[PDB]
């Protein structure tokens, strides 16, 4: 709009009217009075649809975590109550945030075993991986995996490294690492390829596509390749990275990343659909 810019408000803005958030850490008390009977039914529908698709697809740790933490199947979970179990089982807790938050705020939470969860739920007509993460993507997609202590330690170390990053170019590199592991990672298991990425596990379409399709590349995890690989947000992934164990992912954070950012700082990144000379790729 020329000069008098009227725009479509995003869902984050509409849902948070009248609500405040901490100026420093972006947290707020979860607004339980804001979920309508309709939102509880949307949660229940999403949860049930994913639980029929996950067998043979989600890694075993994810399934066990959903069982052990008893994530509510029938309504949006009460964060405080879930935290009673999550803290005792893993040392982590979730904190409510309004929607997207600055990277530095996000790293500081992970570094301190706090996983930020957008509190609001998508509306009825927006059932598959919309614009902006919501409570189902954030809570259902990430929280169960924290039950694996190695994956929880990976996230804590990932956060600590983000807190420390200063080199220009470090942020896009860390964003690609997070996207191709925590959001869209696959893991090879004795029983076949399985999924551990939150952006996949909370999405009906991604859950099916990542293990069924011939078009995408499935490449073995390689830290430096991933930090130098672009990703697209509004379409199915063109490459998925596969780990062999959560220990391999954790061990990847062992080195201090400072020298790695400098090494990649002037590199042209790989396209999201490219295959690099040093990749090991899934056979067929």
Curated annotation (Swiss-Prot):
- In short, the EC number is 1.14.16.1
According to its UniProt record, in which pathway does this protein act?
Amino-acid degradation; L-phenylalanine degradation; acetoacetate and fumarate from L-phenylalanine: step 1/6
Q: Which GO terms describe its molecular function?
A: iron ion binding; phenylalanine 4-monooxygenase activity
> Reaction catalysed?
(6R)-L-erythro-5,6,7,8-tetrahydrobiopterin + L-phenylalanine + O2 = (4aS,6R)-4a-hydroxy-L-erythro-5,6,7,8-tetrahydrobiopterin + L-tyrosine
Question: For Fe cation, which residues are the binding ones?
Answer: 137, 142, 183
Which keywords appear in this protein's UniProt record, sorted alphabetically? Iron, Metal-binding, Monooxygenase, Oxidoreductase, Phenylalanine catabolism
Q: If you read the UniProt record, what top EC class would you report for this enzyme, in one word?
A: oxidoreductase
Q: Which cofactor does it need?
A: Fe(2+)
Q: What is this protein called?
A: Phenylalanine-4-hydroxylase
Which species is listed as the source?
Chromobacterium violaceum (strain ATCC 12472 / DSM 30191 / JCM 1249 / CCUG 213 / NBRC 12614 / NCIMB 9131 / NCTC 9757 / MK)
């Amino acid at each position: 709009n020329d000069r008098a810019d009227f725009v479509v408000p995003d869902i984050t803005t509409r849902k948070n009217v009248g609500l405040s958030h901490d100026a420093n850490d972006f947290t707020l008390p979860q607004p339980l009075d804001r979920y309508s009977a309709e939102d509880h039914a949307t949660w229940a529908t999403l949860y049930q649809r994913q639980c029929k698709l996950l067998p043979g697809r989600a890694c075993d740790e994810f399934l066990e975590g959903l069982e052990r933490l008893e994530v509510d199947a029938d309504r949006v979970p009460d964060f405080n109550k879930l935290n009673e179990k999550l803290m005792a089982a893993t040392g982590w807790k979730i904190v409510a945030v309004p929607g997207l938050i600055p990277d530095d705020v996000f790293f500081e939470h992970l570094a301190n075993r706090r996983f930020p969860v957008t509190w609001w739920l998508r509306e009825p007509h927006q059932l598959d991986y919309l614009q902006e993460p919501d409570v189902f993507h954030d809570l259902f997609g990430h929280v169960p995996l924290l039950i694996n202590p190695v994956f929880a330690d990976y996230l804590e170390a990932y956060g600590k490294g983000g807190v420390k990053a200063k080199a220009l170019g470090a942020l896009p590199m860390l964003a690609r690492l997070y996207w191709y592991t925590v959001e869209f990672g696959l893991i090879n298991t004795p029983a076949g390829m399985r999924i551990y990425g939150a952006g996949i596990l909370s999405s009906k379409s991604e859950s099916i596509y990542c293990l069924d399709s011939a078009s995408p590349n499935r490449v073995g995890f390689d830290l430096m390749r991933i930090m130098n690989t672009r990703y697209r947000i509004d379409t199915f992934q063109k490459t998925y990275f596969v780990i062999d164990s959560f220990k391999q992912l954790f061990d990847a954070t062992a080195p201090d990343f400072a020298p790695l950012y400098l090494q990649l700082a002037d590199a042209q990144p790989w396209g999201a659909g490219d295959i690099a000379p040093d990749d090991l790729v899934l056979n067929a």
